[PDB]
Design an enzyme around this catalytic site. Structure first.
Site, short mmCIF file in Angstrom:
data_model
loop_
_atom_site.label_atom_id
_atom_site.label_comp_id
_atom_site.label_asym_id
_atom_site.label_seq_id
_atom_site.Cartn_x
_atom_site.Cartn_y
_atom_site.Cartn_z
CG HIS A 46 24.70 78.59 8.70
ND1 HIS A 46 23.86 78.68 9.61
CD2 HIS A 46 24.15 78.40 7.53
CE1 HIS A 46 22.61 78.85 9.08
NE2 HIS A 46 22.79 78.56 7.90
CB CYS A 59 19.85 76.90 7.77
SG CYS A 59 19.98 76.99 5.77
CD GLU A 85 23.50 79.20 13.31
OE1 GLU A 85 24.10 79.67 12.19
OE2 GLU A 85 23.19 79.59 13.98
NE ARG A 96 14.57 88.32 1.14
CZ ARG A 96 15.48 87.98 0.44
NH1 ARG A 96 16.75 87.95 0.65
NH2 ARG A 96 15.18 88.38 -0.87
#
Lengths: 208, 208, 208, 208
Positions: free
Chosen positions: C166, C142, C79, C89
């Protein structure tokens, strides 16, 4: 109210860029009592900055909406964040590929879009246009002018709303990819154009 | 010349099936001097067989083109092969899920489609409709009526051409999938309908 | 040198989270002369902040590497950017779903990762582990702990390097998705663990 | 019992084909009291037929299991159907691309695989290897030798079981695709090899 809508020329590879047609088709129309201007940016880092800044200075739009081709995306994506970095995978149309440079040295790491992205998204859904909010616009020219525009908004006070909309391929672009054993998603041009018009309309209804 | 075009009702889950609208919109039109009939099949194994065979006996079409929804496909796919097997993942609309049964015991393992699939594909490309040839139609109802139809052609002599066309979702179906964190590909209805009309036209131009 | 490696518990849905095992397996090991600590964060906004900040205060690591499950990703992604926003979500494990809140009000919009992401990526490639740099980590937990960690680095001076990795699903998680008609990508656990150990090693070789 | 396992050389593009290593690693082993032979077929239509038939005549295997690379697939796929057609997208390694020819003129349109595909699949799942049944093997060399083998089984009486298994890329093949802006799924070699060994073991346990 003036609205600037930009689009780009054919990025490397493609023979057609639908955002060039969206810019030309919206140029000179009036939505409500707002004049809309449409301009097509070069896909050259540097030159695109020069052109974007002259156009912004010259028109001084209240709302700028920048539109670009997102190959392989299947719906309209409204961009949330622009980031201060260039890490070009492809070269731009002059042949320069930039790996890890900032856009504006010492300017913020990111800017959030100022368009009302969730209302634009909800209205698109009401018109049956599939649309979603994307959290990365890439780090090549689409993100470069999205960053430069929201930087200009923060620095000079105008445009008051700035943002980026990425569009799928249109069907006519898919048919030679089929040849190379691939069929990427597409959206028809008329739905793409209707989508950036709905964007202009709910940005105008917000912007006082 | 009579042409049968079928489509299905909403398969489990979906509230809309665009092939039901394609069947109704083509019913009764005439392309050249060919009458086109359009019928909507139930998504129930058994009942769909019954209805398909009555419709085939009653209209005795020269060309039958069966059309179905292929969720997640991004372009028009023209089916090459129908196979003699049912291995349903979902249940059909009555609730029966069939794991590994043949469609017609002792009938051939597979039938190739008799539509001119590569000419249909080339013409779709000429009209800018992305289309490709698929080599598996599934093993649920879309393959069941594709097999039953080409079996009828081999057995009874008519229809003289039979085949299956699968279509993407239409955009209005994508917008509630966005909600469940997903955005599958779509194609607009008008391109789907135009595509099965172009299919009818090059099948007619071949079929004497 | 102390290195903190965190992982998370099973996020909603999943019965297993491989980053929980990576944290436990690296806890207490020494890479060179660096002690590694491994902790497992709750997937609850709030509580995860509380725990992260106690762990950071208590261990005062020189390097923190936060690891999470990216369902559906096919390679290791390192990342680049953490952003100051939460737009969940799914709900977190307590049932709260947060739509558009900042993580730290008035703190910067984004922080770039301080791990040497391109050297980590090149070394992973040398060991044959497919890896790439991702430009969005999501806007659920995350990204929340990735932002909180680099914020702590900027504010309190430690950790000196912070970043997020990830990982794909591991194969044993794929086999019940097959059932729901889907087969997402996976990577075997041993390659995932080896990958965050290679990350620790090139972060340590940079960090003086 | 003799078992033939074949794999192919590097098909066009790829520098490595993992099924070549699976064939060499299984050559000469014994599973239970079954000798296993492993051979690598050329990716040339014609020559591959010649070689396949000599190998089948010479070893007269009870079980033949043909294995190939399925670029972009994310799990092991066990092929259900071989079809009598060649419609090569890529050219074979000699440069011939074949558009719509049958494999054996007048031989059946398709053969179902004779391996116990659902028991192979269930056992792979028990060992945590993600696996599914695929209904099309392509129409290039993977389907060509799968058809030729089940044709030989029907014609000459041996092999008694024949079938095809497609495998994902292995991770080391993914890392130069990352460069062209793409990261296709992969599976590690050791899981691929273990998977075709589990296939040999449940085929042997069925085959009397």
């Amino acid at each position: 109210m003036k609205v600037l809508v930009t689009g780009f020329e054919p990025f490397g590879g493609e023979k057609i860029n639908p955002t060039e047609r969206i810019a030309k088709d919206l140029d000179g129309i009036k939505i409500g009592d707002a004049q809309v201007f449409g301009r097509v940016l070069p896909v050259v880092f540097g030159k695109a900055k020069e052109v974007l800044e002259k156009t912004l200075e010259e028109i001084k739009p209240d709302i700028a909406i920048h539109v670009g081709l997102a190959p392989g995306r299947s719906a309209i994506s409204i961009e949330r964040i622009a980031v201060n970095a260039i890490d070009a995978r492809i070269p731009d149309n002059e042949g320069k590929k930039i790996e890890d440079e900032p856009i504006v040295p010492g300017a913020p790491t990111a800017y959030f879009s100022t368009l009302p992205i969730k209302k634009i998204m909800k209205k698109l859904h009401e018109r049956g246009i599939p649309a979603y909010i994307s959290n990365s616009a890439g780090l090549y020219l689409c993100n470069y002018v999205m960053y430069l525009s929201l930087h200009h908004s923060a620095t000079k006070g105008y445009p008051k709303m700035s943002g980026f909309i990425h569009v799928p391929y249109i069907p006519e672009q898919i048919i030679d990819k089929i040849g190379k054993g691939q069929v990427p998603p597409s959206m028809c041009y008329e739905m793409e154009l209707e989508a950036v018009k709905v964007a202009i309309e709910v940005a105008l209804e917000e912007l006082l």
